[PDB]
Symmetry: C3
Subunit: 180 residues, 3 copies
């Protein structure tokens, strides 16, 4: 069956991320300003927390390929490949659409550890692009998730933040060997 | 068990695709023309149509990494990561080889929507290098495909083309909220 | 689960890796988020008697550790086994320690595969050893399941495998 796993992803401005590479080369008439376009590439890596926001789990890491810019929607479509690292729990890998202005569903391409053999889809919700994102992994194919990953979930909103003890990576507020 | 899904991918020359990034840095001794080589990168996005060429479904989007060029075979091996978007039906993601001079089989790494939990392999058949391709997805793990995606298939040949009404994206010739 | 052992060797003859210093950091280059590394190496079976094919893909550098003297990458690549098919993987490559990659699928005899693969560094940066814990596929051919050479720094392909001679190559091994 499906097990839902909720994850908060936060850019805390402390990992030199993201790196925007303007390889699409598109320029705005009259100003010659860069215009986001197919081919711009964006390596990134943020921090992740559990749904209760009380536990630092690890990081995301991967690469987004910019596909198109929408002036009307004021944002961009990307094609993304990245992983979520949960310390000793293992990792989940995803592939698919990352849209700056709306929610999307990514493929869960697999994982390791407690996630070995996982499959299904994951909902990406932009809370406040690009600093705060919320995921619902609809995980299939694995054993029952540990209770630590299934605490009551904080409902997402732009003001949400990790607990101080999770931001500080203190005991009781980190995944085992959480990914740094 | 296995359901076959046929898809036509066409570069209609209207999306600024592909973007060839010559990062392998190689040139032809004695002419200085670019020589395709490991590390050239190619972001891309084309249109996709159903097997009957009567319906615009959405787009492909992703990134190819050039691996090697063969003078003998007159072509290149790429390692490809991309997705197929079918509007409200969802998406399929793939990973694996794109060889410019012969058919190959990609891994189906998963999907969303009606394709959530899918797996298997997809045959890539080049019809006309580089602008027309035909895929056979050998899909496992999902519900019976909607008959709209299973219309009788137009046989692949160099001259095939989307129906005018599909090319023009008229209502009745597009997937539900087809991906633009 | 079916175990499949694979040796990956950079024999320095494929112009690989190609290091693209797009992270932009300097000390002299400093490895940093956003450096990109296209690569392709040769692969051999666990017995080191057979050339199977190649790996091919792209790594994104995520972070450099001064303390551990190494880097974390996020990797996307495939393993090509000639006519047997391919396996695709996604996940971490850490230059200074073992990791587990997702097996994202495959083709041929590996069509529909899933599970995880352990990446073990033999000697940095030229030799790696993989254990694929393959699920979802039929019994692997005996040729891919020969007694494995235990990993150690001094291992290397049989000379006849390095030379791609008859009896030491996969069917239409990937070049």
């Amino acid at each position: 069956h499906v097990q839902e796993l909720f994850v908060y992803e936060i850019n805390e401005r402390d990992r030199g991320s993201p790196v925007f590479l303007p390889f699409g080369g598109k320029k705005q008439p009259g100003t010659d300003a860069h215009v986001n376009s197919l081919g711009d590439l964006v390596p990134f890596s943020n921090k992740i927390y559990d749904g209760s926001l009380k536990t630092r789990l690890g990081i995301t890491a991967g690469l987004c390929t910019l596909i198109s810019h929408s002036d009307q929607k004021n944002g961009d479509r990307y094609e993304a490949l990245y992983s979520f690292y949960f310390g000793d729990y293992g990792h989940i890998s995803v592939q698919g659409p990352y849209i700056t202005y709306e929610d999307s569903y990514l493929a869960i391409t697999g994982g390791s550890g407690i996630f070995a053999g996982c499959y299904g889809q994951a909902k990406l919700h932009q809370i406040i692009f690009p600093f705060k994102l919320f995921y619902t992994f609809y995980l299939q194919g694995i054993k029952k998730l540990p209770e630590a990953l299934c605490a009551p979930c904080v409902p997402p909103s732009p003001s949400v933040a990790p607990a101080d003890e999770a931001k500080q990576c203190l005991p009781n507020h980190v995944a085992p060997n959480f990914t740094k």
